[PDB]
Amino acid sequence: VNQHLCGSHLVEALYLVCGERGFFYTP
Amino acid sequence: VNQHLCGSHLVEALYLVCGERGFFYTP
Amino acid sequence: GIVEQCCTSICSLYQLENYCN
Amino acid sequence: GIVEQCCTSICSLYQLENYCN
């Protein structure tokens, strides 16, 4: 299992762990 | 961006958020 | 279970932590 | 930044939360 978080997968990880906090960049 | 977590991606998400807790199934 | 919650549907950090340990 | 920490290397939940908001 790849534990690196790159590109879209990094975006999903931020979706997941930032929750209602949000994160850059979601326009 | 796909927000679904399936297969290996679900394993990585558990790696990420379970941290030292661990999770099934890591033999 | 986890597949229905996080793969078929979209799950939150809190839901996903349910499945640790 | 986030790419070096989480893509090139492997990052923890705590590191990744650094980058929220």
mmCIF file of C-alpha atoms in Angstrom:
data_model
loop_
_atom_site.group_PDB
_atom_site.id
_atom_site.type_symbol
_atom_site.label_atom_id
_atom_site.label_comp_id
_atom_site.label_asym_id
_atom_site.label_seq_id
_atom_site.Cartn_x
_atom_site.Cartn_y
_atom_site.Cartn_z
ATOM 1 C CA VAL A 1 0.000 0.000 0.000
ATOM 2 C CA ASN A 2 1.178 3.416 -1.116
ATOM 3 C CA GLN A 3 1.304 5.784 1.803
ATOM 4 C CA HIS A 4 2.244 8.810 -0.276
ATOM 5 C CA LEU A 5 -0.460 11.402 -0.796
ATOM 6 C CA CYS A 6 -0.106 13.101 -4.200
ATOM 7 C CA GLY A 7 -2.355 15.135 -6.430
ATOM 8 C CA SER A 8 -6.052 14.352 -6.193
ATOM 9 C CA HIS A 9 -5.337 11.914 -3.343
ATOM 10 C CA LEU A 10 -3.795 14.709 -1.373
ATOM 11 C CA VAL A 11 -6.889 16.826 -2.016
ATOM 12 C CA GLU A 12 -9.135 13.992 -0.715
ATOM 13 C CA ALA A 13 -6.922 13.610 2.371
ATOM 14 C CA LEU A 14 -7.370 17.304 3.110
ATOM 15 C CA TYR A 15 -11.168 16.966 2.442
ATOM 16 C CA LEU A 16 -11.147 14.134 4.961
ATOM 17 C CA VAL A 17 -9.089 15.642 7.744
ATOM 18 C CA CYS A 18 -9.874 19.318 7.388
ATOM 19 C CA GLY A 19 -13.577 18.760 7.530
ATOM 20 C CA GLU A 20 -15.499 22.011 8.020
ATOM 21 C CA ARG A 21 -12.242 23.920 8.423
ATOM 22 C CA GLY A 22 -11.690 23.773 4.718
ATOM 23 C CA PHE A 23 -8.415 24.158 2.936
ATOM 24 C CA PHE A 24 -6.658 25.868 0.004
ATOM 25 C CA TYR A 25 -7.440 25.527 -2.738
ATOM 26 C CA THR A 26 -11.128 25.161 -2.990
ATOM 27 C CA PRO A 27 -12.418 28.128 -5.063
ATOM 28 C CA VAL B 1 -11.880 15.084 -6.989
ATOM 29 C CA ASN B 2 -13.050 11.648 -5.929
ATOM 30 C CA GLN B 3 -14.021 11.651 -2.295
ATOM 31 C CA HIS B 4 -14.713 7.928 -2.142
ATOM 32 C CA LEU B 5 -12.181 5.820 -0.287
ATOM 33 C CA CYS B 6 -11.898 2.333 -1.823
ATOM 34 C CA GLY B 7 -9.379 -0.461 -1.692
ATOM 35 C CA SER B 8 -5.778 0.594 -1.179
ATOM 36 C CA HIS B 9 -6.915 4.215 -0.760
ATOM 37 C CA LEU B 10 -9.082 3.174 2.119
ATOM 38 C CA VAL B 11 -6.105 1.386 3.672
ATOM 39 C CA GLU B 12 -3.986 4.577 3.355
ATOM 40 C CA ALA B 13 -6.797 6.638 4.909
ATOM 41 C CA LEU B 14 -6.828 4.290 7.889
ATOM 42 C CA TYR B 15 -2.963 4.438 8.033
ATOM 43 C CA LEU B 16 -3.319 8.210 8.114
ATOM 44 C CA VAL B 17 -6.065 8.634 10.670
ATOM 45 C CA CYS B 18 -5.521 5.636 12.900
ATOM 46 C CA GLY B 19 -1.912 6.458 13.485
ATOM 47 C CA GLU B 20 -0.420 4.413 16.331
ATOM 48 C CA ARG B 21 -3.828 2.930 17.103
ATOM 49 C CA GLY B 22 -3.520 0.662 14.134
ATOM 50 C CA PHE B 23 -6.332 -1.025 12.317
ATOM 51 C CA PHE B 24 -7.518 -4.337 10.823
ATOM 52 C CA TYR B 25 -6.115 -5.739 8.747
ATOM 53 C CA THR B 26 -2.448 -5.317 9.157
ATOM 54 C CA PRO B 27 -0.970 -8.808 9.777
ATOM 55 C CA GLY C 1 -19.495 -1.596 7.288
ATOM 56 C CA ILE C 2 -16.496 0.481 6.262
ATOM 57 C CA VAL C 3 -16.928 -0.270 2.529
ATOM 58 C CA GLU C 4 -20.559 0.928 2.418
ATOM 59 C CA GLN C 5 -19.697 3.946 4.553
ATOM 60 C CA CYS C 6 -16.416 5.133 3.019
ATOM 61 C CA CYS C 7 -16.223 3.546 -0.451
ATOM 62 C CA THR C 8 -19.844 3.371 -1.701
ATOM 63 C CA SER C 9 -20.721 6.525 0.250
ATOM 64 C CA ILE C 10 -18.430 9.271 1.518
ATOM 65 C CA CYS C 11 -17.330 9.118 5.117
ATOM 66 C CA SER C 12 -16.093 11.733 7.614
ATOM 67 C CA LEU C 13 -12.967 11.666 9.762
ATOM 68 C CA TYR C 14 -15.107 10.796 12.788
ATOM 69 C CA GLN C 15 -16.736 7.842 10.968
ATOM 70 C CA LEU C 16 -13.477 6.607 9.705
ATOM 71 C CA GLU C 17 -11.898 6.700 13.209
ATOM 72 C CA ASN C 18 -14.792 4.329 14.290
ATOM 73 C CA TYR C 19 -12.935 1.699 12.304
ATOM 74 C CA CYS C 20 -9.506 2.082 13.815
ATOM 75 C CA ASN C 21 -8.463 -0.686 16.287
ATOM 76 C CA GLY D 1 5.543 22.496 1.797
ATOM 77 C CA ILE D 2 2.692 20.003 1.672
ATOM 78 C CA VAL D 3 4.012 18.264 -1.478
ATOM 79 C CA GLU D 4 7.465 17.564 0.010
ATOM 80 C CA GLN D 5 5.903 16.511 3.306
ATOM 81 C CA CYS D 6 2.965 14.361 2.178
ATOM 82 C CA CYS D 7 3.686 13.382 -1.444
ATOM 83 C CA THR D 8 7.497 13.023 -1.670
ATOM 84 C CA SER D 9 7.655 11.890 1.966
ATOM 85 C CA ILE D 10 4.922 10.384 4.125
ATOM 86 C CA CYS D 11 3.058 12.683 6.454
ATOM 87 C CA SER D 12 1.084 12.138 9.681
ATOM 88 C CA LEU D 13 -2.429 13.291 10.532
ATOM 89 C CA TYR D 14 -0.960 16.044 12.712
ATOM 90 C CA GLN D 15 1.270 17.309 9.864
ATOM 91 C CA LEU D 16 -1.510 17.201 7.414
ATOM 92 C CA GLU D 17 -3.838 19.211 9.721
ATOM 93 C CA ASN D 18 -1.078 21.957 9.679
ATOM 94 C CA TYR D 19 -2.221 22.584 6.128
ATOM 95 C CA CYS D 20 -5.922 22.962 6.722
ATOM 96 C CA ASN D 21 -7.265 26.573 6.577
#
